[PDB]
């Protein structure tokens, strides 16, 4: 029956086009959450860049500390030497 | 009319094909959403690491200040001894 068959096919087209809309809406939501995640991943790249600078700072501070150790050992020797000489009188 | 159903026939197949295409794309974005979220797990580890690097810098600063005072003491002990001996 052409009447029933064309009523049937018509209603399916409407269901399919409604689903197309529904699925596209779903995609719109996930595209939004994808973008938010991308922003959060931008912060991760900076977090990495930050921590690598913190290492550079630690080593600069280590280097400073080592230098004072070399200076302090110098003074301890100059002091020890001077004490021997002062016991020569 | 037969031709009028040629219309509906061709459109239904076109719409059903589009649904298939859109769902494949949807599956791909579900894939990247999950993959990205896995990578966001790493961020909690990066932050914790940055905090240990920060504490380490402060520990080394503290060490540097300590040794700085030790050297200043010795530099003082030297000045006294040279001043007295330089009388």
């Amino acid at each position: 029956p052409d009447r029933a068959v064309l009523k049937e096919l018509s209603e399916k087209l409407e269901l399919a086009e409604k689903a197309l809309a529904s699925k596209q809406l779903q995609m719109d939501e996930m595209k939004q959450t994808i973008a938010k995640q991308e922003e959060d991943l931008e912060t991760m790249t900076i977090l990495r860049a930050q921590m690598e600078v913190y290492c550079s700072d630690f080593h600069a501070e280590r280097a400073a500390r080592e230098k004072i150790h070399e200076e302090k050992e110098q003074l301890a020797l100059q002091l020890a030497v001077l004490l021997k000489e002062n016991d020569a009188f | 009319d037969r031709a009028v159903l040629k219309e509906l026939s061709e459109k239904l197949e076109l719409a059903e094909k589009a649904l298939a295409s859109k769902q494949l794309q949807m599956d791909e974005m579900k894939q990247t959403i999950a993959k990205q979220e896995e990578d966001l797990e790493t961020m909690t580890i990066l932050r914790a690491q940055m905090e240990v690097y920060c504490s380490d810098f402060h520990a080394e600063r503290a060490a540097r200040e300590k040794i700085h005072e030790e050297k200043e003491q010795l530099a003082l002990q030297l000045a006294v001894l040279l001043k007295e001996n330089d009388a």
């Binding site: 086009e17 409604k18 197309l20 809309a21 596209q24 809406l25 | 061709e10 459109k11 589009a18």
Partner: peptide
């Protein structure tokens, strides 16, 4: 026959997705 609700393009009756942005007619 129908005009896209996003890019405002007008499409033919046989079209189910927009000819331009490829969004469904009812979205």
């Amino acid at each position: 026959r129908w005009a896209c609700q996003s890019c405002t393009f007008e499409n033919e009756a046989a079209a189910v997705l927009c000819s331009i942005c490829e969004r469904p007619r009812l979205a």
